[PDB]
Amino acid sequence: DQAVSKQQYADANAAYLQSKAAVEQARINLRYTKVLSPISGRIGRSAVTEGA
Amino acid sequence: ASVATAYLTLKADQAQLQLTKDTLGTYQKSFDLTQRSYDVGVASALDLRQAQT
């Protein structure tokens, strides 16, 4: 409707994309703490046990 | 002299009537822009009331 001009939309869109990047960083850090196998194969024993 | 002053004040009041009508048009455009910016929640119900006044 061109009641709030394009620059005040562009900086808000930049803030939205920076918040998406911060949530994607936090989603990576919460994708860790459940450590995934990098590759598939036969696994050895746990060096540290449940509690270390 | 009286008919000259009466004709000139008639022209002046018609000219400023046209200008007041144009300001009413611009105020109405400000009001429906603020009403568009009020429904989705950018502007509260205070700027809308100022534009309405």
Features:
part of a larger assembly; 2 chains; A: 52 residues; 1 helix; B: 53 residues; mainly alpha; 83% helix
Give a verbal description of the structure.
Chain A: It is found in: Cell inner membrane. Chain A: Belongs to the membrane fusion protein (MFP) (TC 8.A.1) family. Chain A: This is Multidrug resistance protein MexA. This is part of a larger assembly, with chains A (52 residues) and B (53 residues). With 52 residues, chain A is mainly alpha-helical. Chain A has one helix at residues 6-31. Chain B is an all-alpha fold. Helix content of chain B is 83%, strand content 0%. Chain B contains two helices and no strands. Chain B has helices spanning 2-39, 47-52. The longest helix of chain B has 38 residues, at 2-39.
The helical percent of chain B reads over 70%
- Beginning-to-end CA distance, first to last residue of chain A: 59 Å
Strand and helix order of chain B: HH
Main pleated sheet of chain A: none
Quantity of strands of chain A, as a count:
0
Series of secondary-structure elements of chain A, N-terminal to C-terminal = H
Category by helix and strand content of chain A: mainly alpha
Count up the helices of chain A. 1
Largest interface: A-B, 3 and 5 residues
Subcellular location (chain A): Cell inner membrane
Family (chain A): Belongs to the membrane fusion protein (MFP) (TC 8.A.1) family.
Protein name (chain A): Multidrug resistance protein MexA
Organism (chain A): Pseudomonas aeruginosa (strain ATCC 15692 / DSM 22644 / CIP 104116 / JCM 14847 / LMG 12228 / 1C / PRS 101 / PAO1)
Topology:
The structure is cut from a larger assembly and holds chains A (52 residues) and B (53 residues).
Chain A: H1 6-31
Chain B: H1 2-39, H2 47-52
